[PDB]
Amino acid sequence: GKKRRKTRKESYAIYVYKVLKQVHPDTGISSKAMSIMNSFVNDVFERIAGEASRLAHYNKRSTITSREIQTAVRLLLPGELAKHAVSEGTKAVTKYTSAK
Amino acid sequence: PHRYRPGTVALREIRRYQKSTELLIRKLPFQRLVREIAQDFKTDLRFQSSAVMALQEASEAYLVALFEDTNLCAIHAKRVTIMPKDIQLARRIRGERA
């Protein structure tokens, strides 16, 4: 174990996988396909959080809330994706808030 | 009785409009189109006059700029008449579509 410890490089890899097994339980994914898939999550993370960044700022808000993300999403994603994402986003925040 | 060559007023109008900067669409109609369209996203919206004006200024940039590119397309087809296929081609290559 260890060569003076090389620091931790994280990626959404295990989650991308879990979700792959949720839709396609008999399907794989190469490292090259996983890497791509990993860039896709970061790309969209950034894109959204940057839109939400600007959105708060325009409104003189110092806080990015579920609503900043929500609007960011509807500005960023096209028709149907925006439709379903909003639907999932609201589903999750609801489940989380009244979960205690 | 006077008659000019087909195309000479055109050139007069080009030099004329390229010299000037006034918005070439009549203010009102455009203002109706903005409302009509905006109505589909949220009903009973009020518009700052500046905000409708911003939108016209840009609509106008867009189309002129697009007519430049549309022009270079018709010219490319060894023609001097802009035609839909020119507009469709310029837009395909710009990324609006594809």
Partner: protein, 79 residues
């Protein structure tokens, strides 16, 4: 009506300013198409900003920011 409110001569004025000399008959409907698409895209974003800031008035900043994220940045209203 409405989209027809954008007059054949007005489209000509823009082709002229853009340096076009001779114009096909079909260009006008095609241009009417194009602009509506341009307006739908920008106004959708404009209104989103308008909605998000719980306003009932589409201000100019809204329009400005819509145009900025459409990649079509506009100066001289944005303050």
């Amino acid at each position: 009506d409405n989209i027809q409110g954008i007059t054949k001569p007005a489209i000509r004025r823009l082709a002229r300013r853009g340096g076009v000399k001779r114009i096909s008959g079909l260009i006008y409907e095609e241009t009417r198409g194009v602009l509506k698409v341009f307006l739908e895209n920008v106004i959708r974003d404009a209104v989103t900003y308008t909605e998000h800031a719980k306003r009932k008035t589409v201000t100019a900043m809204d329009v400005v920011y819509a145009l900025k994220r459409q990649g079509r940045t506009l100066y001289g209203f944005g303050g």
